Design an enzyme around this catalytic site. Structure first.
Site, PDB file in Angstrom:
ATOM      1  CB  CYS A 177      -0.896  -0.126   1.372  1.00 45.23           C
ATOM      2  SG  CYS A 177      -1.669  -1.919   1.422  1.00 45.23           S
ATOM      3  CG  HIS A 316      -2.757   4.780   4.348  1.00 42.01           C
ATOM      4  ND1 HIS A 316      -2.333   4.520   3.418  1.00 42.01           N
ATOM      5  CD2 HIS A 316      -3.245   3.332   4.928  1.00 42.01           C
ATOM      6  CE1 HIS A 316      -2.659   2.992   2.871  1.00 42.01           C
ATOM      7  NE2 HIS A 316      -3.026   2.438   4.196  1.00 42.01           N
ATOM      8  CD  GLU A 327      -3.519   8.157   8.637  1.00 32.57           C
ATOM      9  OE1 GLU A 327      -4.403   7.335   8.251  1.00 32.57           O
ATOM     10  OE2 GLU A 327      -2.926   8.924   7.739  1.00 32.57           O
ATOM     11  CE  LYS A 348      -5.870   4.170   0.860  1.00 34.02           C
ATOM     12  NZ  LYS A 348      -5.176   5.536   1.406  1.00 34.02           N
ATOM     13  CG  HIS A 353      -6.296   0.389  -0.199  1.00 28.74           C
ATOM     14  ND1 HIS A 353      -6.117  -0.082   0.965  1.00 28.74           N
ATOM     15  CD2 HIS A 353      -5.164   0.587  -0.646  1.00 28.74           C
ATOM     16  CE1 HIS A 353      -4.668   0.023   1.326  1.00 28.74           C
ATOM     17  NE2 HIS A 353      -4.171   0.323   0.237  1.00 28.74           N
ATOM     18  CG  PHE A 415      -0.843  -6.005   3.974  1.00 27.85           C
ATOM     19  CD1 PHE A 415      -1.567  -5.272   4.718  1.00 27.85           C
ATOM     20  CD2 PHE A 415      -1.228  -7.218   3.437  1.00 27.85           C
ATOM     21  CE1 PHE A 415      -2.900  -5.665   5.006  1.00 27.85           C
ATOM     22  CE2 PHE A 415      -2.399  -7.509   3.535  1.00 27.85           C
ATOM     23  CZ  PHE A 415      -3.597  -6.822   4.198  1.00 27.85           C
TER      24      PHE A 415
END
Ligand code: NI
Ligand code: NI
Lengths: 427, 427
Positions: A177, A316, A327, A348, A353, A415
C-alpha cells in the site's frame, strides 16, 4: 568533518499529473469528481465473485466516453499481448502526466536526464495461474514468451522508459500500500541528489479478481458491507475494512531550475520524505500509530518544516477499525493543539484503496490541494466517535486559503508495517 | 543559490555480510569456495522438469551439514507456514549479517535508527498457482489467510523488521536482476542523507520451479547446455544463456562515525551509486552497452572517482551472447586504456544467476574483494574471442594488492533495461 560531507541538493517540483482511476481518466476531470464528492465504488457483479464475502470494488471505468479509459488510445492490439493490465494503465497515466508537464524528451541529453520510478504492489495473479494452467495442461510450448515480462513488477517502469525513450534512473518499488509514496519519494531524492533532472514517478495496480479479493478477505482486511455507497467510510464508527480499487497515477517531478528555465507550470514543491517501519505485525498497524508518527516526523525533519506549518493531511485511512484510529492518534500526538487547526481528509471513499497506486494518486491529490488551496472531502463521514474530533473535511470540499505557504502531508502505510510520508507545498 | 541547497551527506560503510547461496551458507565459507573456483550449478533431477529445454540450476544446499541451509536454525515450523521460501532465506541471511556486524538493536533509539531494504525479483509462482487451484477447486475458505503476506514482494523486508525490531525505513525494490544492487544503493543514500544510521540491506529470490524455468526458457534467456560443469560460462565463445539460481544475500551498511564509535569491523566504504535505463528492449540489452556505460559513469560521478582509480569490476555478465559483449564494450568504452590495467570477473559461473539476490551477493563479493585485495575467478573461461581481451581473472583467483586505495565497481542489469552500478572501496 572527516565523517560528514556536504553535497548539493537541488529543489524538486511537480509539473505534470496523470490519472487513471475509478473516478475516471484525466486530471482536471478526476479532480472535479473528487471535490464534488463522487465515488467510483460499485457492486461486484459476476457469478465468479459469489464465493467471497466482499461484494464491492472500485473499477476504472472503461470505454470511449467522457473520463473513461480506452486502452487503444495508448497501446496497440499487439502491445496488449505482451503487457499486463497494470502496465497498460501505467502507460496511459504516464502519457497523460508528460502531456500535462509538456515534457517530451527528444535529444539524447534530455532522454538521459529523465528516468522512471513506477512501482506495482502485486503482480497480476491471473497471469500466473492461467500460465500455470496452460503449462500443466499443454506443456512447455503453451507458455508465452512474454510470460516473464508480463509478471515482473518493474515492467511498467520498463515499458514507459522504452515507449518515451527515458534513459535516466530506472527504478521500481513494491511495498504494498506504500508503493506509490516511495516511488514519488525515491524520485524526489534522485532529482535532489543529481541522479536525474526529471522523473516519471508513480504507482499502478490492477488486481481485482476473485482470487485477490479472496486473499484480502481471508486476511480480514476487506469490508463485508454490501452497500457500495456506504462500504468505505474512513474515520466512521461503522468502518469495517477497505474496498479494493485499481488504477495508475503518475507525476512528473522536475528539478526546480530546470522547470523555471523551460517555463513549465509548477503545481507544488516536494519538500520532504519520511519512512519508517512498525516492526509489529505483518498486516495490522501499530495500534498506537507509533510508526505513523515516526514517518510523519521524519518527513517534517527532511522538509525543515515545523508541525505548526502544516495545513492539510491527506490521510492513509482506508476505513479499517485499527488503522484509522492508529493514524488519528499519530496526528494528535505529533501535532498536539495544532491537530485541530489543520484539516485531514481521506480520499479512499472516492477511489477505493488502489494498493500500489494509492500513494501516488494521493500525492497527486495533495499536490492539487496545495495548488488550489482547496481540500477534497472524506466521504460517508456522517457521525463520529468522541476521539475522532479533528476536521475530517466530511462530505463537502472546503477552501483553505492562506497568505502563508500551504504545506501538506500525505501518508501511506502498508502490509509489513512499511510507512511513508510525503511533505508537499504550494509555491 | 535559490535553486541549490547544501545538506549533510554522511559516509557509509559495510560492517556485516550474510550469505545463503548455492555455494553454501556462511560468509567466510562461501568466500573460500568462491575463491577456490567452486560452483553450485548442478543437474536438474525430477520428472517435473522433463518438458523444459533447460536441465541445470543452482540450488542452495539444504541440511545440517557444513555450509548447508537448515531453515529451522532461523524459523519455527509455524512461521514456515506464513512465509515464502525467499522470505525464509532472507531471514537467515539477515541474522547472519547482523551477527557478522555485531549489531543487535535493543534500545528504542537503536531500533528506530535501523531499517531494512530487502528486495525480491519475483514472487513465488507456486504459492499463486497452488492457491488458485485450491480456490477454484474447494472455494474461498481453502484460501490461506497468509496468502497475501506470503506473496507480497515487501514481506521479506517486513518479516526481518518484525523479527529484529528494526523501525527505520522499511523499503523493498523489485527490479528483476538489478534488485539487490538497488537495495544496497538505496540503503546507501538513506544512511548518507540521514534517514537511518544502519540498514539491513539486500536481495532474495527462490523461484526455481518448472513454471519459472519454463518462462525464462521461452524468453530464450536460459542455457540449454546439459553439462552443469560447463553451462554457465561468462565471456566465453560458447555462452548460450544464464543458469537460474536461488538464494539471499544481506549486508549491514552503517554510518561511518557510528561504526567507528562502537568499534565495529569495517569491510569497505560505499562511495557511489549509479542508475540508468536502456530504453531499448524489454529483455535484451543495448547491444553497444550504452546504458551500462551510463550507470557505471554515474556511479563514478557519485563517488567522485576517476576511471583510472578503479582496480576491479565484478561484472554482471550472466553468460549470454548479447549481454556479456555489451558489458565488455561498455567497460572498454568508459575505461579506455585503463580497461587493460584493471581486472574484471563474473562470479555467476559459481552461484548461478540469483535474480533478485544477484546484485546483493555480488556487492558482498566486491566488498570482500576490496577488503582482502583478492579477486574471485570467472569460471569456465578457457578460451576467448579476439574482442574479449581484458583480464577476466579466468579460472583462478588472483591477489591484487596496492598501497593505493582498492576501489571496485559491481554492475547489475535487468529485464526492462534497468541498470545499476555500485562503487565500493577498501579503507
Ligand atoms: Ni544526496
Ligand atoms: Ni541527501
Amino acid at each position: 568533518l572527516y565523517f560528514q560531507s556536504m553535497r548539493l541538493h537541488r529543489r524538486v517540483v511537480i509539473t505534470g499529473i496523470g490519472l487513471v482511476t475509478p473516478l475516471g481518466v484525466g486530471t482536471h476531470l478526476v479532480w472535479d469528481r473528487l471535490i464534488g464528492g463522487e465515488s467510483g465504488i460499485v457492486s461486484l457483479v459476476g457469478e465468479e465473485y459469489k464465493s467471497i464475502p466482499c461484494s464491492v470494488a472500485a473499477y476504472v471505468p472503461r470505454g470511449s466516453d467522457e473520463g473513461q479509459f480506452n486502452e487503444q488510445n495508448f497501446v496497440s492490439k499487439s502491445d496488449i499481448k505482451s503487457m499486463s493490465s497494470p502496465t497498460i494503465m501505467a502507460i496511459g497515466a504516464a502519457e497523460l502526466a508528460m502531456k500535462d508537464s509538456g515534457w517530451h524528451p527528444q535529444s539524447e541529453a534530455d532522454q538521459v536526464a529523465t528516468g522512471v520510478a513506477i512501482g506495482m504492489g502485486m503482480i497480476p495473479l491471473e497471469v500466473v495461474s492461467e500460465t500455470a494452467l496452460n503449462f500443466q495442461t499443454k506443456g512447455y510450448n503453451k507458455v508465452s514468451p512474454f510470460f516473464v515480462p508480463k509478471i515482473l513488477v518493474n515492467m511498467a517502469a520498463g515499458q514507459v522508459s522504452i515507449r518515451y525513450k527515458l534513459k535516466g534512473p530506472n527504478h521500481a518499488v513494491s511495498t504494498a500500500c506504500t508503493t506509490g509514496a516511495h516511488a514519488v519519494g525515491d524520485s524526489f531524492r534522485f532529482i535532489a541528489h543529481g541522479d536525474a533532472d526529471v522523473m516519471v514517478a508513480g504507482g499502478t495496480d490492477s488486481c481485482i479478481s476473485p482470487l485477490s479479493l479472496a486473499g484480502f478477505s481471508r486476511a480480514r482486511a476487506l469490508s463485508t458491507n454490501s452497500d457500495p455507497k456506504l462500504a468505505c467510510r474512513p474515520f466512521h464508527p461503522k468502518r469495517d475494512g477497505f474496498v479494493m480499487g485499481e488504477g495508475a497515477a503518475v507525476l512528473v517531478l522536475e528539478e526546480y531550475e530546470h522547470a523555471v528555465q523551460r517555463r513549465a507550470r509548477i503545481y507544488a514543491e516536494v519538500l520532504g520524505y519520511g519512512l519508517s517501519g512498525d516492526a509489529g505485525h505483518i498486516t495490522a498497524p501499530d495500534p498506537e500509530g507509533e510508526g505513523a508518527l515516526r514517518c510523519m516526523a521524519a518527513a517534517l525533519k527532511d522538509a525543515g518544516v515545523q508541525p505548526e506549518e502544516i495545513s492539510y493531511i491527506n490521510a492513509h485511512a482506508t476505513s479499517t477499525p485499527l488503522g484509522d484510529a492508529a493514524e488519528n492518534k499519530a496526528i494528535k500526538h505529533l501535532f498536539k493543539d495544532h491537530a485541530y487547526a489543520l484539516a485531514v481528509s481521506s480520499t479512499k471513499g472516492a477511489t477505493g484503496h488502489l494498493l500500489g497506486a494509492a500513494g501516488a494518486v494521493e500525492a497527486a491529490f495533495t499536490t492539487l490541494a496545495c495548488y488550489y488551496q482547496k481540500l477534497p472531502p472524506t466521504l460517508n463521514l456522517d457521525c463520529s466517535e468522541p476521539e475522532f474530533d479533528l476536521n475530517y473535511v466530511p462530505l463537502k470540499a472546503q477552501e483553505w486559503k492562506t497568505e502563508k505557504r500551504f504545506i501538506g502531508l500525505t501518508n501511506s502505510f502498508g502490509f509489513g508495517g512499511t510507512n511513508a510520508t510525503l511533505c508537499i507545498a504550494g509555491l
